[PDB]
Amino acid sequence: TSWSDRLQNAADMPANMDKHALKKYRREAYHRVFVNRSLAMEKIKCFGFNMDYTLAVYKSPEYESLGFELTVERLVSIGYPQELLSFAYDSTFPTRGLVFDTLYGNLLKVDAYGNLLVCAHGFNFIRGPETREQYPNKFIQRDDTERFYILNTLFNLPETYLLACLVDFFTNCPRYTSCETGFKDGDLFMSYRSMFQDVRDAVDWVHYKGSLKEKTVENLEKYVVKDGKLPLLLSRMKEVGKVFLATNSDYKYTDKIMTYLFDFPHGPKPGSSHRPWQSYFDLILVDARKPLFFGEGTVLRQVDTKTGKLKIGTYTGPLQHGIVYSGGSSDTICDLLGAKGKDILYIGDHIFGDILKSKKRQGWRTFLVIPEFAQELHVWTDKSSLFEELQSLDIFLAELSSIQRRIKKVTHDMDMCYGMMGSLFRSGSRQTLFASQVMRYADLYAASFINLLYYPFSYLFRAAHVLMPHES
Amino acid sequence: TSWSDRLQNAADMPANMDKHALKKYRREAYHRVFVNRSLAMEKIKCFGFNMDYTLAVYKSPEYESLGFELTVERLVSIGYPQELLSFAYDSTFPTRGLVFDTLYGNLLKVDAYGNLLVCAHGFNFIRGPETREQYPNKFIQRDDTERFYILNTLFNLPETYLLACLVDFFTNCPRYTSCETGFKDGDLFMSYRSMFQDVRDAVDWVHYKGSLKEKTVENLEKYVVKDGKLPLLLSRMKEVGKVFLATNSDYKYTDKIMTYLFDFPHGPKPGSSHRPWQSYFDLILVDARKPLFFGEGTVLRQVDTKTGKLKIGTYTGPLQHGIVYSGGSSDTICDLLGAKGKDILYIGDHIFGDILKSKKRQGWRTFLVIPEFAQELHVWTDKSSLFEELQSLDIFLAELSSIQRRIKKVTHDMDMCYGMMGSLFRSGSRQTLFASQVMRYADLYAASFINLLYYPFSYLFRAAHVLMPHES
Amino acid sequence: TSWSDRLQNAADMPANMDKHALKKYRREAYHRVFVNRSLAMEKIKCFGFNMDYTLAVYKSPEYESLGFELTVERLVSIGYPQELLSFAYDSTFPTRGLVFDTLYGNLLKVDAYGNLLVCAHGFNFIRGPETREQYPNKFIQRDDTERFYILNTLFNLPETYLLACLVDFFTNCPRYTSCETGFKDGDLFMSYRSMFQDVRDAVDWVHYKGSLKEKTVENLEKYVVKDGKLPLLLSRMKEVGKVFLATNSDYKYTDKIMTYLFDFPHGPKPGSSHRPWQSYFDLILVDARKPLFFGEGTVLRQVDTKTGKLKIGTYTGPLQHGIVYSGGSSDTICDLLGAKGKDILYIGDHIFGDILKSKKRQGWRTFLVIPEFAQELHVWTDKSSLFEELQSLDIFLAELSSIQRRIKKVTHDMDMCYGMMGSLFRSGSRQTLFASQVMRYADLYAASFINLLYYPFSYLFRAAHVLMPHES
Amino acid sequence: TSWSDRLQNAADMPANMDKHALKKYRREAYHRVFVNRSLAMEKIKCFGFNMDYTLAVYKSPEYESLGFELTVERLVSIGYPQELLSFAYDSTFPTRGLVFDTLYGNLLKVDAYGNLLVCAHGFNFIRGPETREQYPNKFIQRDDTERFYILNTLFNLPETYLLACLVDFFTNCPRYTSCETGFKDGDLFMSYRSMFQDVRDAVDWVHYKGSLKEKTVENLEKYVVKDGKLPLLLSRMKEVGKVFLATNSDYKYTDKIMTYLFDFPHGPKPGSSHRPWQSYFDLILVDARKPLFFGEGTVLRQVDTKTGKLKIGTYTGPLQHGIVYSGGSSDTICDLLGAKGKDILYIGDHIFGDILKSKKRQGWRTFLVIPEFAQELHVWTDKSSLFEELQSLDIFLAELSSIQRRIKKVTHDMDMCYGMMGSLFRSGSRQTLFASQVMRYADLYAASFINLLYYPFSYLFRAAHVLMPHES
Numbered sequence A, B, C, D: 001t002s003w004s005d006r007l008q009n010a011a012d013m014p015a016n017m018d019k020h021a022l023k024k025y026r027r028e029a030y031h032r033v034f035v036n037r038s039l040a041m042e043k044i045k046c047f048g049f050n051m052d053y054t055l056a057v058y059k060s061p062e063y064e065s066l067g068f069e070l071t072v073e074r075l076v077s078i079g080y081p082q083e084l085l086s087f088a089y090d091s092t093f094p095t096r097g098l099v100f101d102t103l104y105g106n107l108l109k110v111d112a113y114g115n116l117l118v119c120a121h122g123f124n125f126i127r128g129p130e131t132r133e134q135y136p137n138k139f140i141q142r143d144d145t146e147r148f149y150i151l152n153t154l155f156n157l158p159e160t161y162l163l164a165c166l167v168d169f170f171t172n173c174p175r176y177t178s179c180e181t182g183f184k185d186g187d188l189f190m191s192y193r194s195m196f197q198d199v200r201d202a203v204d205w206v207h208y209k210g211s212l213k214e215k216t217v218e219n220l221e222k223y224v225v226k227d228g229k230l231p232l233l234l235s236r237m238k239e240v241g242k243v244f245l246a247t248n249s250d251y252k253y254t255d256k257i258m259t260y261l262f263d264f265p266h267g268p269k270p271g272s273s274h275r276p277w278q279s280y281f282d283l284i285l286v287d288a289r290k291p292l293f294f295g296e297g298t299v300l301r302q303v304d305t306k307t308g309k310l311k312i313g314t315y316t317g318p319l320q321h322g323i324v325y326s327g328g329s330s331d332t333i334c335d336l337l338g339a340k341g342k343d344i345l346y347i348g349d350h351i352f353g354d355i356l357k358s359k360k361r362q363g364w365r366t367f368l369v370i371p372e373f374a375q376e377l378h379v380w381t382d383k384s385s386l387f388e389e390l391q392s393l394d395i396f397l398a399e400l401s402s403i404q405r406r407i408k409k410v411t412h413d414m415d416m417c418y419g420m421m422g423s424l425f426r427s428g429s430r431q432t433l434f435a436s437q438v439m440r441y442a443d444l445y446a447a448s449f450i451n452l453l454y455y456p457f458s459y460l461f462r463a464a465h466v467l468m469p470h471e472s
């Protein structure tokens, strides 16, 4: 049971729009919208979306394995050894949000302060004392972006695992000599940094020049979650405000995916005429180039929706029915829809490029979709006893040696229930950088934005006020 | 009664080192150390200090008025109108941490998200609806550092007030025509941006080329808080670890100020031989150039402590008794003291240049001194009824029009008890950017670091664990 | 008769190595090496080459027309109008070295000071007075590289003509409205700058992702000059020094072209065994990335000459027989060959990326190949009477109105003998930027480096010393 | 007899404005204007000047020694050793235009290609073979501006000598150990780079914060050449065009110097009423900040000519009689005077900041004043026999070992007649970078712009056309 199994299970259920059924449904944690800062939904005048892993949730582990397989094949194609073909994607290893240290070739799980929570070299999980040789302060400088790469997105899950496979493979292959910063192969030296760049380039290649999109579109049922409640919720949003799409993907791929997402023998509700996906949007913008989109952006272009090609020149005209934009900036959207930032609820899955940047650069309201959250929630509630014991040990240790070794043991057993790299949100009692960024920049979050269907449009999402220590 | 009156009052009390007297003393909020993240003092091996507003707390409002007067005189000296000489510093106007908007000439109090809490043009406090003409989303882009300047330090309190005096003066003087972005004076246009730069340059000039330091040193009793408990606490720190000074000030001024701070007819305790201030430090570093200090820093130099001049060349030698450094970097300190970041408690007053940067760049532990906090605490406890009523109104409004107008009225009455720009930490129920940065980057904070004297060196400072909404 | 016709004509002649025959052959201007700075050939220890338009001279106008056709087809493929397919390359329009002004859409021929010599908007040649509206000082700022693009290479001849075709087409097509800085097409605006970037991108695409290389290699006799004297001269160079290749092209294409260049039923001389092209080189380096090559360069890689792919990792080994390098820097070559800069004669066709940069960055000696020079020389000698009359008019005008109008008329008639954009080297009595860069940075120049065959290896190439006005 | 002795000698002669006397006077080389590019004076509509070493020629060696003495005193004041006070400026050592190599501490005389002509470490002149250890290719990369500093101006003559004094002093002082890149002094290391920066900072300090200007103005007869022909030539320029001043100096100093320059008991000619210096200028601009002046420049300000202070704000008004500008850009001048670049003859002494930059950035016509040229001309004509012998040896050596050693010997004897660093313009038969920049960017040059007085305003300055080798 993967996280996308939970989501597709909830997607196969028709929407019971009885007012009592909704209030009861959103009592379960899997259907709730969780709130970091209070948000009065009645003030939202525009609902904005990205597409990938938000409207189009790619099924797991099939999609990650496809991306992994095509990336491995690209690396072999450019000269990596044939043994890469023996790799097989393993969804229990990677957790999202890890940091690859290109100097020493380690995957790191860190908190918001750069403190080390987990350190794996290949598949070898390095314990505290051994990490101090490379990390004397158990700490990394997050601003050293040349050295450290944060694997933010679900698209990064294949390469997260692949980086560890590669370090593991070169380390244990007798043709290579392991050095502090890479591998020696006779008169060739492969640094972890250049290896990382090859992987990163191959993932980009797979997405932009390879066959990933083609293989996705030829088997959409295998790769993309489909939910009849999606047209219903969007149609309700359009009744109370405006709806826009702003995706980094190109129009041809967006058209294929969105057509599939809306391919039901009916419109918003069973019994209604089917409507094209574009009719659900007041504004459609592709090739957004987020997060640059939230600053100067790029030149605003017009898509020829017949050919899927850009028309030649900068588009200077108005928002017209049927027009599709390419590029532009977030100001394009606000001007064309007559919106201010706080009028907008932007619904995305990229913690940095969608949520952090729209919040900090423009003061948009934010809803973070966390696709793995359906599975994380299941583990969290099933193992809440382990966490509670952890909280008790920390309290008992505060009043006071065998307690500290028991804290590490419970922490490990809890973390392993999530996978080898632990929970997206914490390791034991220590929060991750990702958890901290969610809390700070996502006003609302959930496994799926479809959970908004279970709340009335006048709903006041409420968070407790934050107080300083001296104020409480 | 200024905030420095509270501090000097607590400074005139001898230290009662009875173990029960300490535990009782630190029960009062004015003597507590407040905790944002747990910190086991037994792990601290090095105590580091800045000097200005930490070891040398400048008395208020005398010091701010002196800085104001010399800045006004410098501006008049370079050609500003004689009417500036009629200005008089007013400590009830400025609050620290405001943002000057150089485009429109406004002082802004903002939260961590750039939302507007207060907007004053000159001395005219602009209400919500009128601010939307210039701030359509009631929001500023904090990354637009060319436009927005954050007035972080107590040294910025004179210019905070002076900026408002100047906007007020040019606005109401018939020789000038007010425009959106500055003032027209015939064939001369003075933008708010160039006016701001003149003020900023004049404050720098006053500090580096003017008479401020000279006038301070000639009347240290008037301008600098003096506390016999300072040598005692530093001496206790040196018994359990190492002690270092890292100040942006030059050696000649540091020597004068520190000599005064230690000028008692005794050493750490009454009855003990007096010791020179330098003997309290394992490492003394001046001209630190923080925050660059916490990255590449500058070339490490050696001070000739006889002449107060730098010796010629880069210093390549070891840490020797009596040596004084200039420049260098935070790595200089860690290498020379054999410390890792988390071994260090760095005690400073600059939320950005001392605390944020040492935390994020180096993983140092941090203690933020907030000199005005003595007065803020007094107002907070005296007016806790107003805040409680505010909390109740927000709760009552959440279950549900005359409540919202009452919320704004209580918010104003509460804020005015702090001064015209309100509390350093909030406006009503909304936290400031400064409060958020304190919580995120200051592990400990207090009105004075002397409050550490009331805690044993094995003390475990404890903060509650942070949980995400779905985890609680 | 194109310039490559002259070259291939001289290539079909076997080499007469009789000492008197050589001295007599190099008396004709078409076989001379011309000298800007004295160079003692006996001091040259390494002969270095680029490949494109130096070793592999592409036949004209066939190769330019092929590049033009594929670029037009790429532009139409991305959405430019079908009328582009009616364009046909015209070798009489473009001269190399013109500057495209992306602001106003003009092709400019300039001198080294940025003075305007010729200005064409589309195919409309703008006369002096009309150019002053856009160029008030008849002058462009050459450092404004965002605005002005210098079309340095023969590869730029197709796009030189295509830019003029496009400006001409959009200007005279009634669907578009001509504006100062581009064309309006309803709600789309196409600036000259974005049009230029489309052209530039399409030329790059044609070379790197399109079919240009493929179409060249499938008909090498049509597209590439072949000369049996090339293996002979290289073999003689290797007898007295070292020989290296440093090309921006990739190994697969280099191998195909060079194999063709050496595909004779014999080696250096008729009767000798054929040798593979690689045997003529002590060092072979592809993917050079000049001019960055002459600074930090890129990571040094090793080519797997079986697969044509790079081996994985940085190459740390020594110069071995049969090894082929990729990337690296000019220091790679100097270290591996044990050469200092002035030991090296580098033979290239890129006035900026080969000659200027190797001279200024490294102090290499330089030989500039100018493929069109064979034709320019023919016109120069045939029309020397027109130039002489021009020199006389300038002298007569200096002793003194109908003379000035006659100077412009002779200047035009002379220039048109070269083509519509005149001589590569001048317009009338005014030298071009290209001529000035040749004189300053090319120690030697000729239509072909094969002209070195007509000089003994001890030859002292001599240039007259330059004197200041007061020194003569 | 210094170069300023020649100039002041020619300045003490009244102007004989008889038409025949002028034509005869400008036959002597000392009164000629030398021509690199033809210039029709009738086309010049604006004459522009800098002040320092152009209008105000500082007497030699008195002014250089004053600058040297104050710089040494500043260095000692900040901690350099007392032995510096034993230095005495020596005008026979420095030549203008040398390059200080901050890596190895050498003064270099180079040609335009970075080839080494002279290399002195301290006062030790390093011969060819010994220079190859540090300069393997006898070549420096001129674009390595962090390493190499070109000493362009006469203001740099004191520090040119001082750098050599310092290297000499530290090398031969037993307290210091000489290393490749600087000097070790126990636990202090002084790199040549930081030593150079101290010198550069001290020269700036002397000019901007020290007593150099004050000491100059208190004895103007000692320090500044005064010529009654200066008001006459400027008055004649104003009769045929406009005249402007654009100086990097401030107004207070400009006013003092210019008042002295015009302090005669008469105006342009004996017998005429004296006029204030400002009346000779249509436009006066101080604080120009050249060469940035020739790009974006700085904010245009207005000088209050009563107080010598800037008025507050940007000046938006028109060119008015009596107005004085500060800052701005070259476009300010062109707009206000209604001039295009080629209408302007700009007369300056800074080969880079005045001449090169105004030529390349704006297409101004240029006149380079070379104050030492009066003395260089004397030596050139007196030793023309040595140069002729040198030319003969080079020719004789071209037809062909004892000739080459005789070429070096004649080259040395010729160079030493100019000073220890040889001629500004060459070393033997090799031209300097400075000579090359003069030829390329100075349309006209002379020891003084006063030489323009000997030419009628319709004069056509003529230079021979430049031809490529194949064109002649």
Ligand SMILES: Nc1ncnc2c1ncn2[C@@H]1O[C@H](COP(=O)(O)OP(=O)(O)OP(=O)(O)O)[C@@H](O)[C@H]1O
Pocket (backbone or CB within 6 Å): A112, A142, A143, A144, A145, A150, A152, A351, A352, A437, B360
């Ligand atoms: N999740 C992320 N993905 C990619 N880049 C990020 C992410 N978070 C931060 N960055 C960027 O990485 C750089 C270094 O981050 P740094 O920790 O210095 O600042 P920060 O993110 O503001 O830290 P904090 O979380 O303490 O606010 C910054 O430019 C920041 O914008």
Ligand SMILES: Nc1ncnc2c1ncn2[C@@H]1O[C@H](COP(=O)(O)OP(=O)(O)OP(=O)(O)O)[C@@H](O)[C@H]1O
Pocket (backbone or CB within 6 Å): A360, B112, B142, B143, B144, B145, B150, B152, B351, B352, B437
């Ligand atoms: N108190 C401060 N004083 C001066 N500069 C600051 C302060 N706080 C942040 N900055 C700097 O101002 C710039 C813009 O801040 P921005 O809000 O973009 O990032 P941030 O400070 O990381 O935000 P956040 O508080 O959301 O983490 C950044 O370079 C940041 O480091």
Ligand SMILES: Nc1ncnc2c1ncn2[C@@H]1O[C@H](COP(=O)(O)OP(=O)(O)OP(=O)(O)O)[C@@H](O)[C@H]1O
Pocket (backbone or CB within 6 Å): C112, C142, C143, C144, C145, C150, C152, C351, C352, C437, D360
């Ligand atoms: N033929 C060329 N092709 C491409 N870029 C060039 C060429 N010639 C010069 N450049 C670059 O264009 C920029 C602007 O040239 P600019 O005229 O400012 O300097 P320059 O080339 O040194 O001039 P000069 O010819 O007077 O020496 C510089 O960075 C220069 O290196």
Ligand SMILES: Nc1ncnc2c1ncn2[C@@H]1O[C@H](COP(=O)(O)OP(=O)(O)OP(=O)(O)O)[C@@H](O)[C@H]1O
Pocket (backbone or CB within 6 Å): C360, D112, D142, D143, D144, D145, D150, D152, D351, D352, D437
């Ligand atoms: N006399 C000078 N003084 C100061 N800087 C200079 C001088 N001459 C050139 N420069 C600057 O130094 C840098 C390096 O010069 P470089 O030799 O790379 O270019 P260049 O001056 O165009 O050379 P060339 O003389 O061959 O045209 C450039 O930015 C150039 O503008």
